[PDB]
């Protein structure tokens, strides 16, 4: 073939087709379809050897997942692209894999044509000949103990539109078809004991034409705010390699995690210093809080069950990325093994970010003054998970901090509410006959650190008052306080939650090195307070399927291919068994002090819906930050030209 320059680059369309031809011919004479065809990233060691020790260029490898008509489960393996050969393969009869766009799109038509569904629609007050008005969002079944992984199943959350331009969410139906993905057939419908017929209300709609009817008129177009960069941008991309304000890193992308940032370094006045080997979102879970059947099956693990790459929007087509933008495209396989392309999947731009720092001297009434403005680099994507929109922004900053900002928008998952029916305490009546259930949105940030090089550790940092009492020689006036650092020795030590009582943060640090001034190891500190406990109980489906979510922090030894904390093949796993994070934690005893580590952080929000969220939700923000502390010997932004600067001597002259 043709090799790309960079070993971390995503598979090209050529390489995807090369992978699938190879798999086609290895399974000669068998009806197979493609589920995933994606880069197998090289071993961390091989990569670092090639980057830094003159080691050989790692082989280019593609990971595939296929189904075979008439065989249970899946098959997966590795194709070596240089040699067009399958070098590893195995059958997994008892898992089900990520649901692709194609697996999903056929479900509405299946339910529209199914006779028992048609009858449920009639019983709900919709005539058999208006089946074109019935829509469904197709989900994994998630987990249902009636079937396990024995068939590949979806559940169809059913809605009604009066008009194709309606937002269907004001109009859920009461029942839930279960659909065999591979047979394209409804196998069961969950029907509640109390039937609730379709709402007779107007749809709750949100397009300008709708809004003109509903409130009289749109607001006048607002006077514009324009953003130009006449001399272009300060960042520089070579392929997928970004350089900007001393940062250098590789921007990757795959079907599952969406954006993957690799090989992050900071150029400290000629000394190029590693910070992270890899950072990405590795799994999510969005557990709903109504205990009534079948709503326990709402607990999407969006990343593992659908894919933040597979679900991602082409950007620009609307006004998502405002300004001077560099775009990246995404490439996948379809069922037949032909490359597909999502254009402008990733957007890269730089924005003003307010003040970086400022100080003035009161002595000459602030005539002595220095002000420097902040610019941030944003690498972003937006994915749509049926009703939800997840807006993901990786932000680099000029003090050397890296921030992840998320904005949740889209539409509430809704279920039907009867005239007389109370939504509380599990949900909110956000509109007549509409129940919006409580839920949480949780994410697992996976960090593979390489803080100032190799051999890292992690720690909790808790603010504590001095243990000495008020009025003692040691704490006369009772004000003394310090930071108590707890270095994690073994896996089990790391299993920790955010604590407001101590303003807890976590350090990822290199214990082999030492800041010359402070005497502390160089570190990036995780500052993150949007860290909900998992509300679902110990031993619940939610806690079993997402064992990473029960702690804000989980730190385990590095091994290759430890990406996905809820397992490689997420849908319809019951949560029983030793896999993903539960495997990596083990008996809890393995060393994580001064070695190669992986730090998985759980964060997100608990959402109690309100009418403000409906029919379309205003963005709700989530952020965490990773700040250098004792990494530099001083403010690393001081060499950036000030916006304004006047010395005490210049002030006197002026």
Choosing from 9, 166, 174, 302, the catalytic residue is 302
Q: Is residue 407 within the footprint of a second copy (CB under 8 A)?
A: yes
- DSSP-assigned beta bridge partners for residue 436: 428
Give CA separation, 218 vs 165, 210, 211, 214, in Å.
Answer: 18, 10, 7, 10
For tokens 């960042």, name the residue: 235
Binding partner selected for residue 57 from a second copy, Cu ion, none, CB under the kind-specific 5 to 8 Å limit = none
Binders of a second copy in range 59-118 (CB under 8 A): 101, 104-105, 108
Q: Is residue 299 within the footprint of Cu ion (CB under 5 A)?
A: no
Tokens of 395: 């932000």
Q: Is 302 a catalytic residue?
A: yes
Report d(CA 511, CA 521) in Å as an integer.
6
Binders of a second copy in range 233-252 (CB under 8 A): 233-234
Binding partner selected for residue 202 from Cu ion, a second copy, none, CB under the kind-specific 5 to 8 Å limit = none
Q: Which stretch binds a second copy (CB under 8 A): 38-46, 450-458, 478-486, 554-562?
A: 478-486
Binders of a second copy in range 565-624 (CB under 8 A): 605-606, 608, 610-619
Binding partner selected for residue 375 from Cu ion, a second copy, none, CB under the kind-specific 5 to 8 Å limit = a second copy
Report d(CA 280, CA 165) in Å as an integer.
36
Q: Is residue 272 within the footprint of a second copy (CB under 8 A)?
A: no
Q: Which stretch binds a second copy (CB under 8 A): 15-23, 123-131, 449-457, 529-537?
A: 529-537
**526 CB contacts (<8 Å, ≥6 apart)?**
505, 506, 507, 508, 553, 599, 601, 624, 625, 626
For tokens 């385990």, name the residue: 556
Q: Is residue 654 within the footprint of a second copy (CB under 8 A)?
A: no
Select from 25, 85, 113, 229 the one that contacts a second copy (CB under 8 A).
229
Reduced 3-state DSSP string for 337-357: CCEEEEEEEEEEEEEEEEEEE
Residue closer to Cu ion, measured from CB, 307 or 609? 609
Report d(CA 146, CA 176) in Å as an integer.
15
Report d(CA 173, CA 134) in Å as an integer.
9
Closest to 305 (Cα-Cα) out of 564, 31, 538:
564
Q: Nearest approach, Cβ of 454 to a second copy (angstroms)?
A: 22
Residue 197 CB neighbours (<10 A): 14
Q: Is residue 207 within the footprint of a second copy (CB under 8 A)?
A: yes
Report d(CA 100, CA 335) in Å as an integer.
9
644 is in an annotated binding site: no
Give CA separation, 427 vs 266, 431, 591, in Å.
Answer: 47, 12, 44
Q: Nearest approach, Cβ of 26 to a second copy (angstroms)?
A: 32
Residue closer to a second copy, measured from CB, 194 or 219? 219
Query: Cβ(428)–Cβ(411) under 8 Å?
Result: no
Residue closer to a second copy, measured from CB, 221 or 419? 221
Q: Is residue 540 within the footprint of a second copy (CB under 8 A)?
A: yes
User: What per-residue string of b and e applies to 361-379 under the rule 16 or more CB within 10 Å gives b?
Assistant: eeeeeeebbbebbbbbbbb
Query: Cβ(595)–Cβ(391) under 8 Å?
Result: no
Select from 54, 70, 129, 231 the one that contacts a second copy (CB under 8 A).
231
359 is in an annotated binding site: no
327 is in an annotated binding site: no
Residue closer to Cu ion, measured from CB, 551 or 607? 607
Q: Which stretch binds a second copy (CB under 8 A): 18-26, 65-73, 209-217, 586-594?
A: 209-217
The beta strand positions in 1-123, using DSSP E, are: 32-40, 61-68, 74-80, 85-92
Q: Nearest approach, Cβ of 88 to a second copy (angstroms)?
A: 33
Residue closer to a second copy, measured from CB, 69 or 501? 501
543 is in an annotated binding site: no
Q: Is 263 a catalytic residue?
A: no
Select from 2, 132, 224, 420 the one that contacts a second copy (CB under 8 A).
224
Query: Cβ(415)–Cβ(292) under 8 Å?
Result: no
482 is in an annotated binding site: no
Q: Nearest approach, Cβ of 498 to Cu ion (angstroms)?
A: 20
Instruction: State the pairing for strand pair 236-238/402-410.
Output: unpaired
Residue closer to Cu ion, measured from CB, 562 or 607? 607
Q: Nearest approach, Cβ of 29 to a second copy (angstroms)?
A: 33
Residue closer to Cu ion, measured from CB, 473 or 618? 618
Q: Which stretch binds Cu ion (CB under 5 A): 68-76, 514-522, 539-547, 599-607?
A: 599-607
Q: Is residue 607 within the footprint of Cu ion (CB under 5 A)?
A: yes
Report d(CA 23, CA 1) in Å as an integer.
16
Binding partner selected for residue 281 from Cu ion, a second copy, none, CB under the kind-specific 5 to 8 Å limit = none
Q: Which stretch binds Cu ion (CB under 5 A): 393-401, 477-485, 506-514, 605-613?
A: 605-613
Site string for a second copy, 417-436 (x = CB under 8 A): ------xxxx-xxxxx----
- DSSP-assigned beta bridge partners for residue 160: 134
306 is in an annotated binding site: yes
Choosing from 143, 288, 388, 498, the catalytic residue is 388
Handedness of CA 565, 568, 569, 573 (dihedral sign): negative
Query: Cβ(332)–Cβ(312) under 8 Å?
Result: no
389 is in an annotated binding site: yes
**472 CB contacts (<8 Å, ≥6 apart)?**
none
Catalytic residues: 302, 388
Binding site for Cu ion (CB under 5 A): 607
């Amino acid at each position: 073939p043709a090799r790309p320059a960079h070993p971390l680059d995503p598979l090209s369309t050529a390489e995807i087709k090369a992978a699938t031809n190879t798999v086609k011919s290895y399974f000669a004479g068998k009806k197979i379809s493609f589920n995933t065809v994606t880069l197998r990233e090289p071993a961390r060691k091989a990569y670092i050897q090639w980057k830094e020790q003159g080691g050989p260029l790692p082989p280019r490898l593609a990971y595939y997942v296929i189904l075979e008509a008439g065989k249970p489960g899946v098959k997966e393996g590795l194709v070596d692209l240089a040699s067009l050969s399958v070098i590893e393969t195995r059958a997994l009869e008892t898992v089900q894999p990520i649901l692709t766009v194609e697996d999903l799109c056929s479900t509405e038509e299946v339910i529209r044509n199914d006779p028992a569904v048609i009858e449920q629609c009639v019983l709900s007050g919709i005539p058999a000949n208006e089946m074109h008005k019935v829509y469904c969002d197709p989900w994994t079944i998630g987990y249902d103990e009636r079937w396990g992984t024995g068939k590949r199943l979806q559940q169809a959350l059913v809605y009604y539109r009066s008009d194709e331009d309606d937002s269907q969410y004001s109009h859920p139906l009461d029942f839930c078809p279960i659909v065999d993905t591979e047979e394209k057939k409804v196998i069961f419908i969950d029907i509640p004991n109390r039937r609730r017929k379709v709402s007779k209300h107007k749809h709750a709609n949100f397009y300008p034409k709708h809004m003109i009817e509903k409130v009289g008129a749109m607001r006048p177009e607002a006077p514009p705010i324009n953003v130009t960069q006449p001399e272009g941008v300060s960042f520089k991309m070579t392929g997928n390699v970004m350089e900007w304000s001393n940062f250098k890193f590789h921007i990757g992308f795959n079907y599952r995690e969406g954006i993957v940032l690799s090989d992050v370094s900071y150029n400290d006045h000629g000394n190029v210093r590693p910070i992270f080997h890899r950072i990405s979102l590795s799994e999510m879970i969005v557990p709903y809080g109504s205990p009534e059947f079948p709503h326990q099956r709402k607990h999407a693990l969006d990343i593992g069950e659908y894919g933040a790459g597979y679900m991602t929007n082409p950007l620009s087509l609307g006004c998502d990325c405002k300004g001077v933008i560099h775009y990246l495209d995404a490439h996948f396989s379809d069922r037949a093994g032909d490359p597909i392309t999502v254009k402008n999947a990733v957007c890269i731009h730089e924005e003003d970010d307010g003040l970086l720092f400022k100080h003035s001297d009161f002595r000459d009434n602030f005539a002595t003054s220095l002000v420097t403005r902040a610019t941030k680099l944003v690498v972003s994507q937006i994915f749509t998970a049926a009703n939800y929109e997840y807006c993901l922004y990786w932000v680099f900053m000029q003090d050397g901090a890296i921030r992840l900002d998320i904005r949740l928008t889209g539409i509430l998952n809704t279920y039907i509410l009867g005239d007389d029916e109370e939504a509380g305490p599990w949900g909110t009546r956000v509109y007549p006959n509409v129940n919006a259930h409580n839920h949480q949105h949780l994410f697992s940030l996976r960090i593979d650190p390489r803080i100032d090089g190799d051999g890292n550790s992690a720690a909790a940092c808790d603010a504590k008052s001095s243990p000495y009492p008020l009025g003692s020689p040691e704490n006369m006036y009772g004000n003394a306080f310090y930071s108590e650092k707890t270095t994690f020795k073994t896996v089990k030590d790391s299993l920790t939650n955010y604590e407001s009582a101590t303003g807890r943060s976590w350090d990822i640090f290199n214990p082999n090195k030492v800041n010359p001034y402070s005497g502390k190891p160089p570190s990036y500190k995780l500052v993150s307070t949007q860290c909900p406990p998992l509300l679902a109980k110990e031993g619940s489906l939610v806690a079993k399927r997402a064992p990473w979510a029960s702690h804000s922090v989980n730190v385990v030894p590095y091994k290759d291919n430890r990406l996905y904390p809820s397992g490689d093949h997420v849908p319809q796993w019951s949560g029983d068994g030793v896999r993903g994070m539960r495997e990596w934690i083990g008996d809890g005893s393995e060393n994580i002090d001064n070695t190669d580590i992986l730090f998985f952080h759980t964060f997100g929000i608990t959402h109690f819906p309100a009418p403000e969220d409906f029919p379309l939700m205003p963005a709700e923000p989530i952020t965490l930050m990773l700040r250098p502390r004792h990494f530099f010997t001083e403010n690393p932004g001081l060499d950036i030209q000030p916006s304004y600067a006047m010395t005490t001597s210049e002030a006197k002259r002026a």
